[PDB]
């Protein structure tokens, strides 16, 4: 009766956590057997299978093998064991000589359990610590040596320029400048203090605490100052010593003379983590301090002897590696007198249902981001079967009009039954500036999730490396000579000509789409329209009228630097006449602010000259602070560079090698995307550079990498073979495994990748556990091994997650963090908690634990009375009161109300996954913050969607009650008037910065996040910020949008 007795005949009942797989410890298997047989191959030709413990060091195995070989024949033909080194084939297929004989049999990544014995060939043992490098990278360095392609090999040789220059800036005024590399000063960009931070002082004073140690260790001494906020480390170091060394036996004169000898022997640590105050900066500028002010804490710094610090840094000692345009006056591009034509030939491997699909063809187009001519296909020949067209396609653009950054985008399709099978793009010029001519073999990529479009030009330039995929080969016209792109020298003349040329035209002519009467005077109404355009965001697409308008006024546009992005998108990249002129404007256009100049490194600006300008903008303005904030966007935006070797890559590489905080994250983001073949080689090459030149940090990174591999294995066993076991049984497995000595070794002494300031010491195992999620995240706990553990945090905990794909979270938390800054530094205190996140792999990562915070759900479980009936709206408030009592209470609501206001506005603007009791968290102190963001820009709107403009944070009663102390009819207090006024002021504050937020999302299109496949994904943020309106409308828009989710409140 329920189903109309309609049977589903197909259906048969027989027949979370998804990103697998990999293997770990031996070829077949995740975890090598605890006792194991290993074939030891000797020089004499004997094999002696040796039973070994899983965990045994190679010294042990060698030592025992040369005992056990005695009992086999030919023992007289062996040397002393000391004249031998183990070698074997690893899972990466390379024969690795095993120099570090302390390494354990499980930790070798052996392919088969066997070991060959040899006297060590390659007399520079030192040199063959590229094993260090390739371990850090995750592919062996020798895998590059064998790459044919000369761009690759040229990258490797030429990038060393950058490395050597950075190493020089380190050992310049060493040891100080070395210490400066390792422990850069962690400070805010501005020294100016917001008015709300200042007002937490006594007209600019802070109580501080300087700690000290004298003998032997184990006794420390407070020296509790009350210095000016804007005084500097040196001044604070003095006052600490002054008060330390005042006495009844010391005159005042005698004191100053003991202070001067003492003062410069010390530098300021932070108690509890490896931060240090190493340059003239207002104390208030250092991030630690400014937190201590906001959190109502008394800074705990340590006076540390410079020589005990300079004890702790060893030399980086940079080594140039083993790896240390010739034709003639070749033909200029502008001499070639023909249109472009491109010979298609044959696809080979096209996988299509011939029953389903009629006929298939190659689509093509020339592009520059958007396209220099009519797109064309070829005829629908050899409908499927063995698809073969031996056509020439003919493109209406003269070969001289091809701009330097020009690229062919092609795609095999099916037939209005139009449908892309594969795709691939090619740079029309090579890295040496040489117009591509002859035969090409291009292996194609498969069409991604969202891309219904036929052709895909934003996708990466180059072939697919996966051999077994549609290889569509082809041929380019050959002009009896290698054609090159004209020099700048040449281009400057042709521009100067086109300029002079432009002056003597008739006015009769100057009435068609350019120049005009204006001349050097212009019009005021014109000048009014130009800054009006300029202020528009990047996604408010410009009309042909405005393009021609902007292009004519290109010379005035130099007065308004910030217009450049708009102007460049007005240039007709097909009229080389135009482009040559734009090359001259850009040559010495005024530099612009980095937040603006980043737009010029997205996909829509692929020209070298433009992107150089953009790097020049950064080189000038962008601080080590602001680089480190925007670093994900800058590493990502490398995917849109044409060649391996370029100015942006040389910028970042140098920053990385100059400042080890950047270096640290610069590694991990590259290493993170290593699995993804669109970037495997590029980023590997680059990581090789970094790793070769970063000094000792390689060895530190190598421990972090070793630790993450151990954790990836552990969870991978737990997720595949210990599924369908009890938490109970699983935990017995986890603790057992963690106690083995190879884990104890590999997981205990290292730096947190979430933040390498924190050390991770011994791991307290009693507090380690598998969380309850199906993905089997590990909750890991380490003892902070600092001298002052106690003063900061005694235990350190971070969550490792084997499923999931953190990089959406990673970005939204990064976005949040920027909104907080935008707000706070513009004087308004909304307290967001951008809890740390870091992806290290293919759906793998680390999430900062926030101690003393609970999901609303937990609040309501712990406040739910007697027999399970209904939860109380007040429990939140009742639970919060129980924590905060007295004058403390009033500030705990202010906090809730401030943090709730910001998290309302950010959430609504970003459209993050719907908020509900199990993903909203409140702390003991009363601060609110969201976790588990899901998909950001309303990516569940692919299913229906359409102008939904959703409210994800919908303040239930629960929230409202707390906001208005305890009133009934909460929506009516002044407590809530204020809250709304926070929300409106914050909503508008982000609206004035929406250029950035667009550009930040624009830079992220590079990554393969399904939430960001193309610019209209990003365009949701326009509606929600309401950028096509006035701000007053936008306010009312927001109020409207806010009103209808709560049904009453907002006017």
């Amino acid at each position: 009766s329920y189903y109309h007795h309609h049977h589903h005949h197909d259906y048969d009942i027989p027949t979370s956590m998804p990103p697998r797989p990999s293997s770990g410890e031996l070829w077949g298997i995740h975890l090598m057997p605890p006792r194991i047989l290993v074939e030891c191959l000797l020089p004499n030709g004997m094999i002696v299978t040796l039973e070994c413990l899983r965990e045994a060091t190679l010294i042990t195995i060698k030592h025992e093998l040369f005992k056990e070989a005695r009992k086999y024949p030919l023992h007289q033909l062996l040397q002393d064991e000391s004249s031998y080194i183990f070698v074997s084939v690893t899972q990466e297929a390379e024969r690795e000589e095993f120099f570090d004989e302390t390494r354990r049999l499980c930790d070798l990544r052996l392919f088969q359990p066997f070991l060959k014995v040899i006297e060590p060939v390659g007399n520079r043992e030192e040199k063959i610590l590229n094993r260090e490098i390739g371990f850090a990278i995750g592919m062996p360095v020798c895998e590059f040596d064998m790459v044919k392609d000369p761009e690759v090999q040229d990258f490797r040789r030429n990038i060393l320029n950058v490395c050597k220059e950075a190493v020089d800036l380190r050992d310049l005024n060493s040891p100080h400048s070395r210490a400066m590399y390792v422990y850069p000063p962690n400070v805010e960009s501005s020294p100016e203090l917001p008015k709300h931070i200042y007002n937490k002082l006594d007209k600019g004073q802070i109580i501080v605490v300087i700690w000290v140690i004298v003998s032997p260790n184990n006794d420390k001494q407070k020296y509790t100052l009350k210095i000016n906020h804007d005084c500097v480390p040196e001044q604070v170091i003095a006052e600490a010593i002054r008060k330390k060394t005042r006495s009844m036996l010391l005159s005042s004169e005698q004191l100053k003379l003991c202070v001067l000898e003492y003062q410069g022997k010390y530098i300021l640590k932070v108690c509890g983590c490896d931060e240090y105050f190493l340059e003239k900066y207002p104390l208030s500028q250092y991030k630690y301090i400014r937190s201590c002010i906001m959190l109502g804490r008394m800074p705990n710094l340590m006076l540390m002897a410079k020589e005990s610090l300079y004890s702790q840094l060893p030399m980086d000692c940079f080594t140039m590696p083993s790896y240390s345009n010739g034709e003639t006056s070749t033909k200029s591009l502008w001499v070639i007198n023909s249109a472009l034509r491109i010979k298609i030939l044959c696809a080979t491997y096209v996988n299509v249902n011939i029953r389903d699909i009629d006929k298939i063809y190659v689509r093509t187009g020339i592009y520059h981001g958007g396209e220099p001519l009519c797109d064309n296909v070829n005829t629908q020949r050899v409908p499927c079967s063995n698809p073969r067209w031996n056509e020439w396609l003919n493109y209406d653009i003269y070969i001289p009009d091809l701009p330097r950054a020009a690229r062919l985008c092609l795609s095999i399709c099916s037939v209005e039954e139009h449908c892309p099978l594969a795709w691939g793009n090619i740079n029309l010029f090579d890295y040496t500036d040489t117009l591509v001519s002859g035969k090409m073999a291009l292996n194609l990529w498969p069409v991604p999730h969202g891309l219904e479009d036929l052709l895909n030009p934003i996708g990466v330039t180059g072939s697919n490396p996966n051999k077994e995929t549609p290889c569509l080969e082809l041929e380019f016209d050959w002009f009896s000579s290698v054609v090159k792109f004209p020099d700048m020298s040449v281009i400057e003349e042709h521009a100067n000509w086109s300029v002079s040329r432009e002056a003597g035209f008739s006015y009769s002519h100057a009435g068609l789409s350019n120049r005009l009467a204006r001349d050097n005077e212009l019009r005021e109404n014109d000048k009014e329209q130009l800054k009006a355009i300029s202020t528009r965001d990047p996604l408010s697409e410009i009309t042909e009228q405005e393009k021609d308008f902007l292009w004519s006024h290109r010379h005035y546009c130099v007065t308004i630097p910030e217009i450049l992005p708009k102007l460049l998108l007005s240039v007709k990249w097909n009229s080389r006449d135009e482009v040559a002129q734009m090359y001259c404007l850009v040559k010495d256009w005024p530099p612009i602010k980095p937040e603006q100049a980043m737009e010029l490194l997205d996909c829509n600006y692929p020209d070298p000259m433009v992107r150089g300008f953009a790097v020049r903008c950064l080189e000038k303005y962008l601080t080590d602070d602001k680089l480190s904030q925007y670093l994900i966007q800058l590493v990502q935006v490398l995917k849109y560079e044409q060649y391996l070797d370029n100015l942006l890559v040389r910028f970042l590489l140098k920053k990385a090698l100059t400042n080890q905080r950047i270096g640290h994250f610069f590694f991990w983001h590259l290493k993170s995307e290593m699995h993804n073949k669109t970037v495997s080689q590029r980023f590997g090459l680059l990581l090789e550079s970094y790793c070769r030149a970063c000094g000792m940090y390689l060895k530190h990174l190598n421990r972090q990498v070793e630790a993450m591999e151990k954790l990836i294995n552990l969870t991978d066993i737990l997720k595949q073979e210990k599924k369908d076991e009890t938490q109970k049984v699983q935990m017995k497995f986890l603790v057992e495994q963690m106690r083995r000595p190879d884990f104890m070794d590999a997981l205990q002494g290292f730096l947190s990748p979430l933040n390498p300031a924190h050390q991770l010491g011994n791991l307290r195992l009693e507090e380690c556990r598998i969380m309850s999620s199906a993905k089997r995240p590990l909750w890991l706990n380490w003892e902070n091994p600092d001298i002052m553990s106690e003063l900061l945090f005694q235990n350190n905990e971070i969550i490792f997650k084997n499923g999931d794909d953190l990089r959406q979270d990673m970005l939204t938390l990064q976005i949040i963090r920027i909104m907080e800054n935008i707000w706070q530094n513009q004087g308004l205190d909304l307290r967001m908690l951008p809890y740390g996140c870091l992806s290290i792999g293919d759906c793998v990562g680390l999430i900062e634990v926030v101690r003393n915070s609970h999901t609303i759900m937990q609040i309501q479980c712990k406040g739910g009375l007697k027999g399970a009936l209904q939860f109380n709206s007040h429990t939140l408030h009742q639970w919060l009161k129980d924590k905060n009592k007295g004058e403390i209470y009033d500030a705990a609501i202010d906090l809730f109300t401030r943090s709730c206001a910001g998290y309302c506005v950010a959430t609504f603007i970003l459209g993050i996954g719907d908020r509900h009791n199990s993903n909203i968290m409140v702390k003991d102190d009363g601060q609110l913050f969201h976790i588990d963001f899901g998909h950001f820009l309303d990516h569940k709107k692919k299913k229906f969607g359409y102008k939904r403009e959703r409210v994800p944070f919908v303040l239930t009663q629960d929230f409202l009650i707390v906001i208005s102390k305890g009133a009934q009819e909460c929506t009516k207090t002044r407590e809530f008037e204020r809250f709304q006024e926070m929300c409106y002021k914050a909503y508008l504050a982000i609206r004035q910065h929406a250029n950035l937020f667009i550009n930040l999302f624009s830079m992220m299109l590079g990554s393969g996040m399904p939430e960001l496949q193309s610019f209209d994904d990003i365009a949701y943020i326009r509606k929600t910020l309401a950028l096509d309106k006035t701000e007053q409308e936008a306010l009312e828009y927001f109020m409207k949008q806010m009103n209808d989710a709560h049904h009453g409140g907002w006017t």
């Binding site: 998804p18 697998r20 797989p21 293997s23 070829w27 074939e39 191959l41 004499n44 030709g45 004997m46 094999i47 024949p73 030919l74 033909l77 084939v89 899972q91 990466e92 297929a93 390379e94 024969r95 392919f111 088969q112 066997f114 060959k116 996988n351 299509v352 249902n353 389903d356 699909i357 958007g370 396209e371 009519c374 797109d375 099916s414 449908c419 892309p420 099978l421 498969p446 219904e452 052709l455 077994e468 009435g511 789409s513 408010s540 410009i542 009309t543 042909e544 009228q545 405005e546 021609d548 097909n574 692919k942 299913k943 229906f944 359409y946 102008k947 209209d1016 365009a1019 326009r1022 096509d1028």
Partner: protein, 267 residues
């Protein structure tokens, strides 16, 4: 008429109606202190926006103003190209695709039962997008598992090389120690050397048989890899049309009765 006008609607949702149409498709849009209307012409997967200015009666792009209405200006350019006004626009306003989507949708004027179809098609769609997604994971898992096999084979082959060398390595040092002396040990010595050598080659034999057995699984994997792609590309074209009908149905409704909020139960 000028409110109806087929192509007249009156930014994002323009681009979504323009998405995946051919070279020549168009429509018109509406700050007023900017201009009045906006022609949005599509050319080779890209959207060309052309400004419509209104002052003393005339409606135009710039100079050639004598067209007394909005509909006057568009019919003129449906027949003709745009190059005579502004150079690099030698493409017409060919496809005025803005039918109010009564072309099919079973011509259903039911209102309610058109909405039932919208659920039906959107369930088929949402089902289909999972199948597409499911298969894309299989594809990319398989691409990986394959190359891991390809690497494993090289490792196997390299392992074999070290063992092929080892059986050869002993021949040299063993058959020096057969001929010198010979009576010393003799069968005692050479047997227990012959044993070691007999282990060594049958081991190689196993190893090689281990590699082969991988390779046969590689072809079977590589075969299935093709079968996934094969069926991805079967599902792809239905998925676009099933999607396209579900836009036109949802549009046909949001012509007459606005009911933007009523939709979410079906969808």
């Amino acid at each position: 008429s000028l409110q109806d006008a087929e192509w007249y609607w009156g930014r994002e949702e323009v681009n979504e109606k323009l998405r995946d149409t051919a070279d020549g498709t168009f429509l018109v849009r509406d700050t007023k202190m900017h201009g009045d209307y906006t022609l949005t012409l599509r050319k080779g997967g890209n959207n060309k926006l052309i400004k419509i200015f209104h002052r003393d009666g005339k409606y135009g792009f710039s100079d050639p103003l004598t067209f007394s209405s909005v509909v006057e200006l568009i019919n003129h350019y449906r027949n003709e190209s745009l190059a005579q006004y502004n150079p690099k626009l030698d493409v017409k306003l060919l496809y005025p695709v803005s039918k109010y989507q009564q072309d099919q949708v079973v011509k259903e004027d039911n209102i309610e039962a058109v909405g039932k179809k919208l659920h039906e098609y959107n369930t088929q769609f949402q089902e289909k997008s999972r199948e597409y997604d499911r298969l894309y994971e299989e594809y990319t898992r398989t691409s990986q598992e394959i190359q891991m096999k390809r690497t494993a084979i090289e490792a196997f082959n390299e392992t074999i090389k070290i063992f092929e060398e080892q059986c050869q390595t002993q021949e040299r040092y063993s058959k020096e120690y057969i001929e010198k002396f010979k009576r010393e040990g003799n069968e005692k010595e050479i047997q227990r050397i012959m044993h070691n050598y007999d282990k060594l080659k049958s081991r190689i034999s196993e190893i090689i048989d281990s590699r082969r057995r991988l390779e046969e699984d590689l072809k079977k994997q590589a075969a299935e890899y093709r079968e996934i792609d094969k069926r991805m590309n079967s599902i792809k074209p239905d998925l676009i049309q099933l999607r396209k009908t579900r836009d036109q149905y949802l549009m046909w409704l949001t012509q007459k009765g606005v009911r933007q909020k009523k939709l979410n139960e079906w969808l």
